[PDB]
Design a binder for this molecule. Structure first.
Ligand SMILES: O=[N+]([O-])c1ccc(O[C@@H]2O[C@H](CO)[C@H](O)[C@H](O)[C@H]2O)cc1
Ligand SMILES: O=[N+]([O-])c1ccc(O[C@@H]2O[C@H](CO)[C@H](O)[C@H](O)[C@H]2O)cc1
Ligand SMILES: [Ca+2]
Ligand SMILES: [Ca+2]
Lengths: 121, 121
């Protein structure tokens, strides 16, 4: 199991020690407060009122937690995933990323605390 | 394992099928959008900017997800719990509850989708 912080201003994302293999079942829990600029802060689901202006993941709100598995496209994580199985053709190391517009991570603040575990399968 | 919705306007709380027993390790993942009154909506962590005016759980923000276990007091759940063990002498059925002031649930809206499972020990 992996546990760590994902900083909102980390454009490259946080690499985990988790390698998703075909058939794996995983659970993720994410908590905390972060911002993509404003003085306010949002949780792992991000800001539901902010328009998508070129987010790295169009399937989640700005300020949400998302992930990549290997060289996949971005996948929404939000508050987390419960005993979750990846789509076929997806496999590799899990990198966690704060959802923002590329090149704009500089003024981000806060972070999410995240646990990732592999479940029984 | 249990999966279900916890309505924000349910003052009595949502009873689950989970009975917490001594030594149990559990994981919870909660997601969604709810409100304790305003047109705006907040995730499972609630509204970090709203003052506590007599909430059923003083250890969580207004609009956060909390729980009771048997006859325990309220325990914060927020976005969820990862492989979590209960405090001493805490056991019994798990009931999930939206954190609000007693007698004011009437104007609440939305809900959280919640998964609860027991982990291997
Ligand atoms: O026009 N607004 O209401 C508005 C409010 C907040 C804004 O924050 C902006 O969001 C961008 C992403 O969408 C970038 O994250 C940028 O760093 C940030 O300042 C940008 C515009
Ligand atoms: O003083 N305010 O700014 C203020 C704004 C919104 C408020 O919503 C209020 O919150 C209460 C809990 O603290 C109750 O949930 C009440 O039903 C709700 O209308 C209550 C007060
Ligand atoms: Ca930003
Ligand atoms: Ca209310």
């Amino acid at each position: 199991a992996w546990k760590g912080e994902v900083l909102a201003n980390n454009e490259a994302g946080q690499v985990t020690s988790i390698i998703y293999n075909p058939g794996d079942v995983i659970t993720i829990v994410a908590a905390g407060w972060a911002s993509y600029g404003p003085t306010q802060k949002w949780g792992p689901q991000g800001d539901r009122e902010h328009p998508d202006q070129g987010l790295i993941c169009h399937d989640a709100f700005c300020g949400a937690l998302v992930m990549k598995i290997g060289n996949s496209g971005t996948i929404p994580v939000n508050t987390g995933l419960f005993r979750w199985v990846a789509p076929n053709n997806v496999q590799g190391a899990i990198t966690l990323i704060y959802n923002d517009v590329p090149g704009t991570y500089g003024n981000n603040s806060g972070s999410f605390s995240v646990n990732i575990g592999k479940d029984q399968s």
